[model samples]
Each structure stands twice: as structure tokens, then as C-alpha cells.
Target: YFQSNAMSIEIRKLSIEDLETLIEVARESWKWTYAGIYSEEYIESWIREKYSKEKLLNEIVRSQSNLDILFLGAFADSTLIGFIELKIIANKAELLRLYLKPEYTHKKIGKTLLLEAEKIMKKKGILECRLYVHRQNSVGFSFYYKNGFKVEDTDGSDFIMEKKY
Candidate 1:
């Protein structure tokens, strides 16, 4: 079968069946994304706890049962390529996590994922969305900035950014 070179990406809510690949995406992104900004040991330990099946399963289940939590994934040809996690409270959505396979970065995949999540937020009456990016991670900062997020504060380690829908 001949395949076209055009690559199409789909964004949708994630499920428990996506657990394994989700962990893979998070682990790989965390390793390279935080390499110089965070200690190797710290990054590994964080991934160990955060990417564990138990922790992720809880998040997936929670999102399934609640409108306030969202776990949206980006897929290319049915493979999980990246994801964004958000938590909504009151009238705001907090972007808790956004990660992509290292090779897939800077291709607008992240923006696409965020926009999908933002659409849901708007439908749910959310007024704004906010997130944090490591202060030293210029790549992350640049992406968020270009996507219409503006910095509101900094805690030395991370910048708090917000965007209104």
C-alpha cells in the first residue's frame, strides 16, 4: 500500500487504554526536556512517581467521571504523540501538564492539543486558562508565549502564564 507523506494529527480525550503509551511519552519528554534545568536524579525520580501506572490511572479515571479534569491526547495515525492535562476550578482551567515526544516538538502539535482543550474549557464556561513553565526551559516558554499566554508571575523555578478565552 502506498502512503501519502502528509501527516495528520487528531486530538481527543485520553482513556485508560492509552496508559502505557502515555507513560512512554511523558518519560521521554521529561528526560530531555528537563535535562539541564533539573538534576538527572530529580527528573528520574519525578518521572518514577508521576508516570507510574497507579498515578496515571487515577488521573484517567478522574477525568472520565468529571468535567473539571481533562486529559487530552494528540494522535498521529492512531499512535499517541503528545498530551495535555488540565484541571478546571471555579471559572479557570489550570494546565497541569503538556508533553510531546521529543521528535515531535516545534511542529505545532502542542498548540493543536492546547486549542482542543481550550475549546472544551470555553464550552464549559471557563473564563481563562493558566499554566507554568520552567524558567530555564526557553523552548517551553517560547511555545507558550507564541500561543498567546502571558506571564503573570514567577517563583524562581517556573513562570506562571495565563490566557483568556
Candidate 2:
């Protein structure tokens, strides 16, 4: 149903069936995305800290069912190439996570995911969208800037960016 029309790629809400798959994607992509810039301890710790299945379950059930968060999985031919997670509040949507398989980088797949997230934010009456990137991750910082997000603040290695509508 999603193949013949529209974007020709699947971008939809995640389900329980996709939890392990999503967790795997997060683990693999995190290592690939932060291997050199962060310590091995940092990488491992971050994954355990953020990508636990239990926490993901809460995020899915709480935000999605409550209409407070939007989690989108991007698939090309049923394979989960990436996922974007956003936390939307009264007037702002924070990009909590956006990760793609390293092989899928530079294909504008991330852009597609981001635009879809922002579109939902607009519909939800959000006027601003924010995200944080590691200060040392030049690739990520550059990507956010090119997409109309500006650096709003920083905390150590994290740079906060905001895109205002």
C-alpha cells in the first residue's frame, strides 16, 4: 500500500514488533556515528543510558498514545533504514533522536525523515523545533545548519539548535 503511491518509501509510526529492530538500529548507528569522537566507555554508556528496550517502550506508549511525541521509521522495501524521534510540547518540538545507517548517509533520507517530523510539528501547533548535536560532530552540526537550524546554546559538547517557523 505504501509502495505504489506517495513518497514511494514507508515513513510511519513504530510498533512493538519494531522495538528490537529499532534498538538494533540505534545501537549500530550510534557506534558508527560516534566511534571516533567519543570514548568507548561513552559510546557504550550512552547506548545503555538511552536505547534500552524498556525505556523505548515507555516512549512509544506514552508519547505516541498521548500525542506528545512522534516516532517515525523510514523504510525502503520494508527494511528499516532509519528512524526519527521527536518530543513535542506546547510550542516546540525537540528532535530527540535521528539516526541512519552509515551506508544510507547523504541520500537525503534523513532530510525526508526530518521534514516529516517538522510537518507533524507544524500541524500540532508547534512554532519551534529544537535539537542538540555533539559539538565535536562537525558532520552533524553542518547538516543541522544547512537545514535552517541555528545554534541557540551549548552545554559542554552538546550544541542546542533551533529552527523557528
Candidate 3:
């Protein structure tokens, strides 16, 4: 479903029906981004725990009833290709997860997702957004930096990036 045209990708909030697709995308994204940073076994375990159908269902349910948790999906030709997860905490929004298919990077898809996430955050009176990127994830660091996030702190293994709205 790679349409060559970037504009074909649509960004929208995740719903109950999107859980299965989100699981697949989440697995692919974790493997693609953490191949070297984490062992295969570790990645597989994480995916199983985090992207499980049961857990994703819980997330979708929570997002519908709770304003604090948000899950947004990026679809290409109606196929789930990427997603972002956000947790609002008073004045700040925690960017819990932002992942896309390996081929989707550098096409402004991540930026678009981030932009849309921030809009919702701002509406809730959020003054900043923060995320943690693995120290070795140069691509992740670059993407966040390009999106106006500045490295505010690090604790050996990861860099905490923050963007003030």
C-alpha cells in the first residue's frame, strides 16, 4: 500500500477495530528499530507483552473512556503503518511510543503524527512534550531533534528529549 505520494497517508485516533493491525505494525517497528540495540529475544518478548491483542484492546478501551491516554494510528490506504502513544500529565505530555514501518521514515510521516499529537496535547493545556530515546538510536534522536525536541537529560542508556509548546 505504499502509494509513493506521501499525502495518501492518513492520521487518526486508534479505535477498537484497529487493535489487530496495530499489533502487526508495532511488532515490525520494534524489530526494525531495535535490531542492534536489543537482542532478538528481548525484542520478541517486549512485543509480545506490549503489543498483545489483550493489551492493545485495553489501550483502545482506555483511550475511549479516559482523556489522559491517547493512541493515534497512521494509515496508508487504510492499512496501519505507524502509530503514536501519548500520556497527558497535567502540564506535560509523555510521548510513550512513536513508531513506523522502516520504509516510512524520512517521508514526513512521523512529523505529521507528532504534530497531530501535539495539537491534542495543547488542547488539554499541555505546555511540553517529552520522550525517551535509546542512546544508540541515532535515527530516533535525529527525528526528535528535527521535530524541535531538545535533549534535556540522559541516564547512560537513553536520552530524554523535551519540546516546549
Candidate 4:
């Protein structure tokens, strides 16, 4: 029921029923992206621990009052090609996770997801948005930088970037 192009993308708030798809996407994307950067064992462990469907379902079912977890999906021809997850705490919103199937990269899907996440935060009275990227992820850094996020802080090799709305 949603479709858009590079200039914009339709965003839909995910329901608990989407848990299985979200988990599947997480597994596929993470496996492809982290294959070389992280050991196979480590990547598999992390995926199982963090991206488990049960975990995501619990979060969806018991979301806290002060914390808002928004899961936005970008679709093409009824297929979910990308997603962005934002977590809001107080006045700050964190772009916790953004991922697309490897084949869907470089298609402006990430940018669309990010823009939608920012719009949601702005609507919620969030004054600032932040995200952290690993130093080794040059592609991610470039995407964030090109999208108007500035580095606000850093620890060792990691970057903590922010954009003020």
C-alpha cells in the first residue's frame, strides 16, 4: 500500500505483527554487512542476541511511557526494502538502527528513512537527534555526513553525530 522514489519514500509505523519481518531483515542485513568486519561467530551471536523476534516483540508489546521506539519501513512494489528504528528519550532522539537489503543500498532508501525519522522526532518535540557509527564503517559515515549530521562527540574510534532540529 506504499511506494515512493528517491526524492521521497512512504513510511509506515510498524505494528507488533511486523516483528517477524523485522527480525528477518535484521538477520539478512546484518549478516551481509558485518561479514568481513566481525568474525562470523561474533556476528551470528550478536544477531541472535539482539535481533531475536522475541526480543523485538517484547519491546513492541511493553514500550515505556517516556521512551518511544519508532520502526519505519520503506517499501517498493509492496516489498519492504529498508527500515529505520528511532528511540526517543526525553528531548533526545537516537537513530538506533537503519538497514536495507544489500541490493537496495545506494538507492536513496537510507536517506528517505532518515528524513522520515527526523520528521517524527520533530513532531514529538525532540530538539536534537543523535547516532553513533563505528569508525570502520566509511559508507555509514559518508551517508550521515551527507545527510547534514555533524559529529558532536567521539570516543576512541567511534563517532557520535548529532543534528539539531
TM-score of each predicted structure versus truth: 0.89, 0.86, 0.90, 0.84
In angstroms, give how far residue 3 of model 1 lies from its true place: 12
For model 4, residues 25-97, the per-residue Cα lDDT tens digits are: 8787687656658888898799988887787776555332225777777766556777877777788888878
lDDT of all the models against the reference? 0.83, 0.81, 0.83, 0.75
Give me the runs in candidate 4 sitting further than 4 Å from their true place.
Answer: 1-9, 61-67
How far off is residue 32 in model 2, in Å? 3.4
Best by TM-score: 3
Give the worst 10-residue stretch by lDDT in candidate 1: 1-10
lDDT of 1 by residue, 1-165 (tens): 113222777888889899999888878767876788778779879999888999888888877876668998888778888898998888988998888776566446788898888788777899988898888888888888888999999978889999987
lDDT of 3 by residue, 1-165 (tens): 454455578898899998777888878877976788778779879888888899888777777775678889988778788898988767878888898876666448888888888887777788988899998888889888888999999978889999998
Clashing residue pairs, backbone N/CA/C < 3 A, model 4 = none
Best-to-worst ranking by TM-score? 3, 1, 2, 4
